[PDB]
Amino acid sequence: ALVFFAEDAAIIGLAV
Amino acid sequence: ALVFFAEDAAIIGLAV
Amino acid sequence: ALVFFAEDAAIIGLAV
Amino acid sequence: ALVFFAEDAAIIGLAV
Amino acid sequence: ALVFFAEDAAIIGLAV
Amino acid sequence: ALVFFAEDAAIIGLAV
Amino acid sequence: ALVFFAEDAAIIGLAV
Amino acid sequence: ALVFFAEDAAIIGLAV
Amino acid sequence: ALVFFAEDAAIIGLAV
Amino acid sequence: ALVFFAEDAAIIGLAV
Amino acid sequence: ALVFFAEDAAIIGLAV
Amino acid sequence: ALVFFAEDAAIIGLAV
Numbered sequence: 001a002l003v004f005f006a007e008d009a010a011i012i013g014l015a016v
Numbered sequence: 017a018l019v020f021f022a023e024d025a026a027i028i029g030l031a032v
Numbered sequence: 033a034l035v036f037f038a039e040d041a042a043i044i045g046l047a048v
Numbered sequence: 049a050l051v052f053f054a055e056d057a058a059i060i061g062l063a064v
Numbered sequence: 065a066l067v068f069f070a071e072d073a074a075i076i077g078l079a080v
Numbered sequence: 081a082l083v084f085f086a087e088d089a090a091i092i093g094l095a096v
Numbered sequence: 097a098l099v100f101f102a103e104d105a106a107i108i109g110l111a112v
Numbered sequence: 113a114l115v116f117f118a119e120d121a122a123i124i125g126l127a128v
Numbered sequence: 129a130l131v132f133f134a135e136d137a138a139i140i141g142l143a144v
Numbered sequence: 145a146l147v148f149f150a151e152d153a154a155i156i157g158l159a160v
Numbered sequence: 161a162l163v164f165f166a167e168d169a170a171i172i173g174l175a176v
Numbered sequence: 177a178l179v180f181f182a183e184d185a186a187i188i189g190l191a192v
Contacts, residue, residue, distance in 0.1 A: 001168060002178055002192065003039035006064075007019035007029070008049060013039070014064065016166075016174065016178065017088060018050055018064065022128075023035035023045070024113060030128065032050065032086075032094065033136060034114055034128065038192075040177060046192065048114065048134075048142065051087035054176075055067035055077070056161060061087070062176065065152060066162055066176065070112075071083035071093070072097060078112065080150075080158065080162065081120060082098055082112065096098065096118075096126065099119035102160075103131035103141070104145060109119070110160065115135035125135070129184060130146055130160065144146065144182075144190065147183035151163035151173070157183070167179035167189070 004014040020030040036046040052062040068078040084094040100110040116126040132142040148158040164174040180190040 001172075005021060005037060005039075007021075012049075017092075021037060023037075028113075033140075044177075053069060053085060053087075055069075060161075065156075069085060071085075076097075081124075101117060101119075101133060103133075108145075117133060117135075129188075149165060149181060149183075151165075165181060167181075 002016050004016070005011050006014060018032050020032070021027050022030060034048050036048070037043050038046060050064050052064070053059050054062060066080050068080070069075050070078060082096050084096070085091050086094060098112050100112070101107050102110060114128050116128070117123050118126060130144050132144070133139050134142060146160050148160070149155050150158060162176050164176070165171050166174060178192050180192070181187050182190060
């Protein structure tokens, strides 16, 4: 799976 | 809001 | 073009 | 995280 | 199918 | 323009 | 609604 | 940044 | 395949 | 046009 | 919910 | 990388 990143604090993974 | 990242140079935020 | 990032290991570019 | 909405019944969250 | 919402006035469905 | 919605609290517009 | 464009020939609308 | 196009009238930019 | 357009200068194709 | 697939039962087309 | 498909091996569901 | 599918004929991969 791919893991995108986004700041939400911390930078979290968004895994697909 | 979430902040995505992209290189455009520098790595800019893309906020949603 | 923009370059997004994703972990796949290593963090790869995804260029648009 | 953001929560989008969609009807599926009920209107469910889609969290990112 | 899922139905997203968007204001366009009225709030319309966007069905997928 | 279209206005999507997301909970972030409050439900904010995301306009396109 | 918004109308995006894409070549498919001709350039067609994609309406949302 | 990239600029997408959409008819909304006129054809507007959507910049990212 | 579909070809989207974006200004980047020139208007480039983005083919899918 | 492209036709994506999704299970919804049956696997339906999503045409663009 | 919808289930998209992607090869990752095996073809996995991506449910929304 | 992930490989999505779309009919375009044949069903082609779309790799990310």
